[PDB]
Design a protein around this ligand. Structure first.
Ligand SMILES: CCC[C@@H](C)[C@H]1CC[C@H]2[C@@H]3[C@H](O)C[C@@H]4C[C@H](O)CC[C@]4(C)[C@H]3C[C@H](O)[C@]12C
Ligand SMILES: CCC[C@@H](C)[C@H]1CC[C@H]2[C@@H]3[C@H](O)C[C@@H]4C[C@H](O)CC[C@]4(C)[C@H]3C[C@H](O)[C@]12C
Ligand SMILES: [Zn+2]
Lengths: 183, 750, 105, 228, 42, 55, 150, 146
RNA sequence: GAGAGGA
DNA sequence: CGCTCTGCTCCTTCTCCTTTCCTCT
DNA sequence: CAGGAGAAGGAGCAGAGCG
């Protein structure tokens, strides 16, 4: 009976969503775990993400073969492709109401074995081209614009909340049946 | 239903849809011809029409079908295309020129007999009761028989226990490529054979190459959480590390190394291998992006089906199941033939243009449209010859089919009507295989359960029933958006762990996503279909053995109308029948008002159908309009067929075509090779509700003999009869045989 | 059978998501992801009814009665942003669950 | 028993579908005798008397442990011991790769040790673990199943689906003078050519009599003589 | 489809099975059959 | 073995490490496991069914 | 054009799979006749029924006789059609037996047939397999050029 | 037929909710199929014998079966009384759908009149599912010959 | 040549 | 005492058959 | 287009003898 409103804000350019296919939620009642993250590489016009998570060497690192077969690798590389999916909105609660924001991009990150490729290419060294191949060409022609990280924020929340229902946008010429017909 | 959608409607509707859509589709496909020299010279096919010179305002004059039949000509209409040819002064000019003559199917949107009523037909020497749907080529009535085939782009898994081998082949069929991607099981190890790769590639490697490289999401996409499946699939998960550990690029390189496909231009082995996954592996799905999750999950579902078959047989699907088969009519075959002929014509025209323009100087462009009229004989000659001889020679697919067209049978009226609406099995002989020749219960209402050439095609050749409508490709893109609105998460937003915890909705064979509450989704989609939001032929159903909500939209599915019943009671409500009998609600407002709906073979799995209104328990969701529509046009001849033994009904269906009698109203204005006629045909005493609809009481083949069932004279021991003289004298069984003899006074070259 | 179990599961998801919305009123870093039909019918309110029934509206009067997406887990999902190709990719936090809405009849 | 059976006898095929070995027991007045003999002539896999299989590593070695449950052995009254199972595994390791050492720790817990190059131990041990609970421990490794059937007048005999006629005749608990299979070539191999002729004639006569047709036996005898 | 001597000999319609062991014979007819009880057997 | 390593999720492999010590780890990962003897059992409980006794 | 007469040996079907050949053509007076003088056009043997179970044909005969006596065309349709009880009522109203079995007089001895005879109109259709097109005989004539065989 | 249907229905519910005593050779489902097939054969034989004994003198099918001129007592029993079981390939009709024979029966239904039983004689007239099952058997025979 | 009865 | 032929035995991949004809067209 | 059955080469081990 009690009204529980929600309002959609502006686009605020594009905010993406990362999904770690490998990292699960905690088996306990407190799934507040998040690995240390740094060295994020983005790639536009092909929608590529590369997230690097360093690993602690005091627990199950195998210091010998890591440098014997590869270089000084201590961080697994999570690569992902940002797929577009309309209708996906992220919601957060500031007051009794709910604030929504478009997502327009979701990426599932999976481990990438860059060191294996590097080792193979080092060991080996001693015309439309249409279709997805062309896209792959871009993916390995120019890429890897560097980017930083930031843990915790408030300016995004403030810029999403300053809408304060100034443009309620309640005007709607259609009705239930019209919307059903024009899905 | 038969007034709005006649018995011969597969051929008519398919040909009309062809001439209305596929002509322009092929035109826009091959809309441009280029050259290495003279970059400012191109031909643009703006528009194409059949029998319509420019505006005209009137269909061009066609030779009447009977005149074509008598003169041994070919019934056809001209094809007029638009022309855009440039000039050295860079001036674009337009023209409308004939490009050939396409044969016209009788009683189609192009034939003159379209909407002719008992006076135009009489003036054109055409029988009003003639079925139509057949071509007149070289003065011969040739009909393109409906071809049945396995469903394209669908998974068919057969467990060959004879060796312990199971498989997951898919005959993906595109407009250009058609290839089978089998997923066999050898040495307890799942593979993936192909006609373009070398030998038995392990499944783990192809799954890594398709994007799912985690090596644990494989176990969550092929086994879910069943312990009895993981141990079965654990055997082949270690082949991605036994040879050596793999990454996505390494797996692509490995699959491309053994690719047998040749490259006409130099491409890297990894580059080719990506192609081998991009398009070559599954022609059905082309992943022209940076994410291959759809193809990877498709292969994962194929492997899941294979593992399900491995753990316990009897979970496979029968190939002979009617819902697994599609029917291709004359329209699609003619579309293929015309596309091949048109591409050959364009290649020849471009070669001739390059040859003429090769001269360095004075390369005139005036009268550039001479070679097109020179070659316009080639297209029509090839079309007529391919239709007449029945040998459909194609090169794009390297497909050769023989006996597609049959000479229309003229013995009785029912023979000519039953040759139409006939289905030919794709199997050549099926010597001892008693599978495709059996009577599958799934064809109830879809195929005539009594009419079948007895003998050596006894089970291969089948005939359509009365209540039966063949589907056509409605849509594919809008339904994805409709599903996403309906509340299924996309395929790129569901983790592999929870992918097998709830029903996943498959749209036309390819996984789209997973949606909770499958019953609500199915009910809402069916309501949307009934209220008219989507096409009536889009069939959605639920499979529970593998949790799925399948949606089928492609044409060729066999559908029949059924009365929708709500909780406990029907929806006709006894007042819509009154309006139907009055003259309104011509079975189309019945679909618009959601009283009846088309069920195909697969959607009947989810339904509970009542034979009669008095049997409706408050759980059934459909009602039979009438149970006597399970028999075709021929089988409607039998009186009280539900009392006879089934082989008797089959023999009657076989021998009713070869019963002499009235053939057509113009049977005396007709010169055919061999006509049998009855002097005094008589309407049957014991009629049938079917024979009124097919007009068998207006052109009967038989007489009401006063039979006395009695052993008499001894000359009637084994099936022999005792005809009564003094009745033969008065005229009883009197018949006539008409035979034509043709003579051509050819003019020799001398 | 199927309908009754579906209704019970829908009621359970309604009460569970109401509890989740009440619980995540604190806003340290948590989000939630909504799926909506496209074309933007044109906001409204997620009006809760008696006996734990939840429904939404838009500027047009339309009661999209669809609540409760997959309870999928063991896939750590977090949300980030992009700011004009400059120093960007600010971690906006993780999401608790997912909601999918659907127009009804 | 239709046309395909006559075709199989006529063509003298080396393999036929559903070959049935009728074996008559020496003592068939009690089911206790009828089941102790049956267990000797069945493909009794390890899986039915393994009760679990595990793969256990150590600091520098690894092995496979399977504890045979004596309860099922006693309830199935099989005549075999731990040493019998071990020697059966070693002898049937023809299908497997290699097996030379078997140990017993207590209450029949057989351990098979695999010791050797990178990943060879792990892959070999995994394959051995997968292929361990299917080695025929007791019986004849050419038999799908065997069922005790009760004849009229109280007699009973065992019907076997397989190709082990010589072994079935040899094993104790049955009378070898009366034990016959459907397969003609098997009878030819194990009992001379005259027995093959007798089997051909008798099987053709039985097939054409079960179908109710009246063909004189002399034509069948002529056919058998022509074949043999 | 060249008809090699092997094609001319082998097959169901080859010389051995179409012309040597079973030929077409003269002084033969083929017609429909009807009963005739008044006609004696033989 | 049928075990998967965190941060790699590939299948676990037993390798003859230094001095012939069987170490459990995954390729393509900076991960190992000093072996405790793996006394955690990979036991497969074979689905034996009911049996009947006459003797 | 060629006008053909139903010669002996022509194939007639019965719309129930009871295909047969014209065994004999007998004169009208050498035929059974009822009280009204009707002689049958076709005398089908009764042995075609007991092993082929064409009860639909018997029901067709009764329905046809009742309809023609009532001056209407009866319906034999799958799962329905004119019920047998109504047709038998019509048949007994006109003075005929309820089962359609009249009592005939032998046409050659002129006495009653000691069993009532199933008698009525059945829709018989003449098939195209006529003996005139199938009779074929050879003594000498054309021989194959290759093997010198007929 | 009602008694046989009642017995088959109680056997079906016993197989569903609980378990039935499996025959020494087959499994549970095959035991159920064999038991219901035997029961249907017995009831058909009994009603056929009743019909044959109740058939009067001077009956044309009866005479043609007694003298052996055409047919037998089974044919006249099917024409008059009942044509019980339409066995195809040595067993009852297979499943033409998911856990069903026809869409006119409940899912997972094994009772007679739903898996190839024709309680209607040819004189009475076949019900649509019975007609389809008989057509399946007839086409099986026709294909078998060729 | 190949399309189909037919027994 | 390993080494090196023979020899045997699988194992795989290959080849030759599927009524009668009896018509028409 | 399926089904059945042989003949012919690789290929992997026992077995024998040996300098
Ligand atoms: C796994 C493959 C099974 C099958 C191909 C093999 C495995 C065992 C073989 C039989 C036995 O050798 C005993 C007999 C020997 C005689 O000489 C010829 C017949 C005989 C029955 C054999 C036939 C055939 O050769 C069998 C069935
Ligand atoms: C995050 C804390 C680190 C530590 C507690 C975690 C991280 C990696 C985990 C091991 C691996 O998963 C591989 C094995 C899987 C088997 O199922 C159980 C044993 C096994 C050795 C695990 C034990 C334990 O669970 C480990 C050591
Ligand atoms: Zn690892």
């Amino acid at each position: 009976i009690e009204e529980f409103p929600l309002k959609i804000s502006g686009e605020e350019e594009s905010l993406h969503v990362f999904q770690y296919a490998n990292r699960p939620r905690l088996v306990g009642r407190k799934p507040a775990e998040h690995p240390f993250i740094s060295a994020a590489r983005y790639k536009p016009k092909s929608h590529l993400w590369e997230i690097d998570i360093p690993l602690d060497e005091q627990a199950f690192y195998n210091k010998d073969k890591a440098e014997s077969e590869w270089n000084g690798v201590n961080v697994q590389t999570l690569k992902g492709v940002g797929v577009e999916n309309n209708g996906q909105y992220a919601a957060f609660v500031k007051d009794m109401q709910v604030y929504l924001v478009p997502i327009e991009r979701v990426a599932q990150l999976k481990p990438f074995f860059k060191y294996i490729d590097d080792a193979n290419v080092t060991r080996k060294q001693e015309n439309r081209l249409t279709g997805s191949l062309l896209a792959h060409k871009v993916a390995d022609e120019e890429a890897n614009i560097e980017l930083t990280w930031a843990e915790g924020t408030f300016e995004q929340f403030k810029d999403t909340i300053v809408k304060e229902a100034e443009d309620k946008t309640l005007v709607a010429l259609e009705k239930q049946e019209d919307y059903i017909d024009n899905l | 239903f038969l007034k709005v959608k006649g018995l011969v409607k597969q051929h008519l509707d398919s040909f009309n849809y062809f001439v209305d859509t596929d002509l322009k589709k092929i035109i826009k496909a091959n809309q441009l011809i280029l050259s290495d020299v003279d970059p400012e010279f191109y031909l643009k096919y703006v528009d194409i029409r059949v029998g319509k010179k420019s505006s005209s305002s009137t269909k061009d004059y066609l030779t009447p079908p009977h005149e074509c039949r008598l003169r041994d000509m070919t019934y056809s209409a001209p094809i007029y295309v638009d022309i855009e040819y440039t000039r050295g002064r860079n001036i674009i000019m337009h023209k409308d020129v004939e490009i050939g003559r396409m044969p016209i199917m009788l009683r189609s949107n192009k034939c003159i007999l379209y909407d002719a009523d008992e006076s135009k037909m009489a003036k054109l020497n055409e029988c009003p009761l003639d079925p139509g749907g057949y071509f007149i080529v070289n003065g011969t009535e040739k009909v393109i028989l409906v071809q049945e085939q396995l469903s394209k782009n669908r998974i068919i898994v057969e467990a060959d226990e004879k060796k312990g081998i199971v498989q997951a082949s898919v005959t993906s069929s595109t407009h250009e490529r058609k290839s089978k991607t089998y997923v066999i099981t050898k040495n307890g190890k799942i593979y993936l054979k192909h006609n373009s790769i070398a030998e038995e590639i392990p499944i783990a490697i192809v799954l890594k190459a398709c994007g799912i490289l985690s090596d644990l999401e494989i176990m969550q996409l092929v086994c879910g959480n069943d312990s009895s499946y993981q141990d079965i699939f654990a055997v082949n998960l270690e082949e991605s590390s036994k040879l050596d550990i793999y990454t996505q690029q390494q797996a692509l390189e490995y699959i491309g190394a053994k690719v047998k496909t040749m490259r006409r231009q130099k491409l890297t082995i990894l580059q080719e291998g990506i192609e081998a996954i991009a398009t070559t592996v599954i022609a059905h799905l082309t992943v022209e992006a940076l994410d291959f999750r759809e193809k990877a999950l498709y292969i994962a579902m194929m492997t899941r089906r294979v593992v399900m078959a491995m753990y316990n047989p009897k979970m496979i699907d029968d190939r002979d199941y009617v819902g697994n088969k599609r029917l291709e009519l004359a329209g699609q075959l003619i579309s293929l033939l015309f596309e091949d002929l048109f591409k050959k014509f364009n290649n020849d025209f471009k070669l001739s243009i390059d040859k003429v323009l090769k001269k360095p100087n004075r390369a005139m462009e005036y009268d550039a449209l001479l070679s097109i009229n020179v070659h316009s004989n080639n297209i029509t000659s090839g079309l007529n010859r391919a239709i007449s001889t029945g040998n459909w020679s194609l090169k794009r697919f390297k497909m050769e089919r023989a006996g597609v067209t049959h000479v229309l049978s003229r013995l009785s009226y029912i023979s000519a009507l039953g040759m139409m609406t006939r289905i030919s099995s794709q199997f050549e002989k099926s010597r001892k295989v008693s599978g495709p020749r059996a009577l599958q219960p799934s064809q109830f209402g879809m195929l005539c359960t009594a009419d079948t050439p007895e003998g050596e095609a006894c089970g291969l050749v089948k005939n359509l029933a009365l209540m039966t409508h063949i589907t056509t490709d409605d849509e594919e893109e809008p339904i994805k958006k409709l599903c996403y609105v309906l509340g299924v998460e996309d395929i790129t937003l569901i983790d592999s762990a929870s992918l097998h915890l709830n029903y996943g909705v498959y749209l036309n064979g390819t996984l789209i996503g997973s949606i909770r509450f499958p019953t609500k989704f199915v009910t809402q989609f069916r309501h949307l279909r009934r209220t008219g939001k989507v096409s009536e032929f889009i069939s959605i159903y639920s499979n529970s053995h593998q949790m799925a909500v399948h949606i089928a939209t492609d044409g060729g599915r066999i559908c029949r109308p059924l009365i929708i019943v709500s909780d406990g009671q029907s929806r006709v409500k006894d007042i819509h029948l009154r309006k139907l009998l009055d003259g309104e609600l011509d079975f189309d407002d019945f679909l618009k008002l959601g009283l009846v709906e088309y069920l195909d073979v697969n959607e009947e799995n989810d339904s509970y159908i009542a034979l009669y209104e008095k049997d409706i328990v408050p759980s059934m969701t459909h009602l039979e309009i009438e149970p006597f529509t399970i028999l075709g046009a021929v089988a409607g001849l039998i009186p009280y067929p539900h009392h006879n033994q089934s082989p008797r009904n089959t023999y009657q269906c076989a021998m009713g075509k070869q019963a002499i009698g009235a053939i057509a109203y113009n049977q005396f204005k007709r010169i055919d090779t061999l006509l049998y006629l009855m002097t005094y045909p008589q309407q049957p005493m014991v009629k049938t509700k079917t024979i009124e609809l097919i007009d068998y009481d207006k052109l009967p083949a038989g007489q009401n003999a006063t039979v006395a069932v009695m052993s008499y004279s001894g000359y009637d021991i084994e099936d022999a009869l005792v005809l009564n003289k003094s009745s033969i004298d008065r005229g009883f069984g009197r018949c006539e045989t008409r035979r034509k003899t043709t003579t051509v006074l050819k003019r020799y070259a001398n | 059978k199927e309908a009754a179990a579906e209704l019970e599961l829908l009621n359970a998801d309604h009460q569970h998501i109401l509890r989740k919305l009440k619980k995540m009123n604190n806003k340290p870093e948590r989000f939630m992801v909504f799926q909506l039909p496209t074309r933007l019918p044109a906001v409204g309110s997620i009006r809760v009814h008696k006996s734990g029934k939840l429904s939404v509206k838009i500027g047009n009067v339309v009661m999209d009665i669809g609540k409760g997406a997959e309870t999928t887990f063991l896939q750590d999902v977090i949300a980030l942003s992009i700011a004009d190709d400059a120093s960007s990719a600010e971690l906006l936090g993780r999401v608790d669950g997912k909601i999918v809405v659907t127009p009804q009849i | 028993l239709g046309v395909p059976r006559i075709k199989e006898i006529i063509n003298a095929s080396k393999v036929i579908s559903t070959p049935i070995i009728n074996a008559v027991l020496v003592n068939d007045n009690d089911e206790r005798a009828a089941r102790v003999v049956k267990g000797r002539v069945e493909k009794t896999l390890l899986s039915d008397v393994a009760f679990y299989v595990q793969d256990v590593y150590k600091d520098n070695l690894s092995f496979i442990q399977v504890r045979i449950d004596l309860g099922t052995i006693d309830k199935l009254q099989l005549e075999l011991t731990i040493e019998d199972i071990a020697v059966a595994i070693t002898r049937a390791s023809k299908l497997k790769i290699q097996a030379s050492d078997v140990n017993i720790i207590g209450k029949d817990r057989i351990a098979i040790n695999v010791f050797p190059s990178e990943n060879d131990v792990f892959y070999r041990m995994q394959q051995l673990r997968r292929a361990l609970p299917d080695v025929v421990v007791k019986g004849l490794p050419d038999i799908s199943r065997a069922v005790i059937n009760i004849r009229d007048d109280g007699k009973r005999e065992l019907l076997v689906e397989g190709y082990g006629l010589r072994d079935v005749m040899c094993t104790d608990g049955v009378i070898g003078s009366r034990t016959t299979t459907n397969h003609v070539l098997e009878v030819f191999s194990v009992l001379g050519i005259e027995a093959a002729r007798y089997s051909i004639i008798r099987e053709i006569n039985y097939t054409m009599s079960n179908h109710g047709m009246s063909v004189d036996p002399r034509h069948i005898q002529l056919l058998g003589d022509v074949m043999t | 489809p060249i008809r090699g001597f092997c094609q001319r000999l082998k097959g169901k319609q080859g010389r051995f099975r179409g012309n040597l062991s079973g030929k077409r014979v003269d002084f033969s007819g083929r017609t429909v059959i009807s009963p005739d009880p008044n006609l004696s057997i033989d | 073995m049928l075990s998967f390593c965190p941060s790699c999720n590939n299948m676990l492999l037993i390798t003859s490490g230094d001095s012939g010590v069987y170490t459990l780890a995954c390729r393509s990962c900076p991960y190992e496991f000093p072996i405790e003897g793996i006394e955690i059992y990979d036991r497969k409980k074979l689905p034996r069914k009911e049996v009947d006794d006459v003797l | 054009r060629q006008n053909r007469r139903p010669e002996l040996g022509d194939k007639f079907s019965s719309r129930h799979g009871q295909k047969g050949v014209c065994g004999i053509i007998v004169k009208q007076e050498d035929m059974p006749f009822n009280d009204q003088g009707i002689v049958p056009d076709i005398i089908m043997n009764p042995h075609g029924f007991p092993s082929r179970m064409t009860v639909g044909k018997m029901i067709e005969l009764i329905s046809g006789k009742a309809g023609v006596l009532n001056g209407t065309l009866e319906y034999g349709t799958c799962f329905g059609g004119s019920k047998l009880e109504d047709m038998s009522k019509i048949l007994v109203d006109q003075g005929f037996n309820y089962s359609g079995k009249d009592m005939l007089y032998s046409g050659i001895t002129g006495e009653c047939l000691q069993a009532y005879i199933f008698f009525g109109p059945i829709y018989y259709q003449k098939l195209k397999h006529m003996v005139l097109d199938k009779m074929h005989a050879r003594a000498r004539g054309p021989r194959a050029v290759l093997t010198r065989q007929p | 037929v009602e008694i046989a249907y009642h017995k088959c229905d109680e056997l079906i519910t016993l197989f569903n909710k609980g378990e039935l005593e499996t025959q020494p050779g087959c499994n549970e489902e095959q035991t159920l199929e064999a038991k219901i097939g035997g029961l249907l054969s017995k009831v058909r034989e009994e009603v056929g014998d009743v019909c044959i004994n109740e058939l009067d003198n001077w009956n044309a099918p009866l005479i043609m079966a007694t003298c052996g001129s055409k047919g037998s007592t089974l044919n006249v029993s099917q024409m008059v009384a009942v044509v019980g079981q339409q066995i195809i390939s040595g067993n009852r009709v297979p499943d033409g759908f998911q856990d069903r024979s026809l869409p006119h029966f409940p899912k997972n239904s094994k009772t007679p009149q739903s898996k190839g039983f024709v309680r209607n004689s040819f004189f009475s007239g076949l019900s649509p599912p019975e007609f389809l099952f008989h057509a399946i058997s007839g086409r099986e025979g026709l294909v078998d010959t060729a």
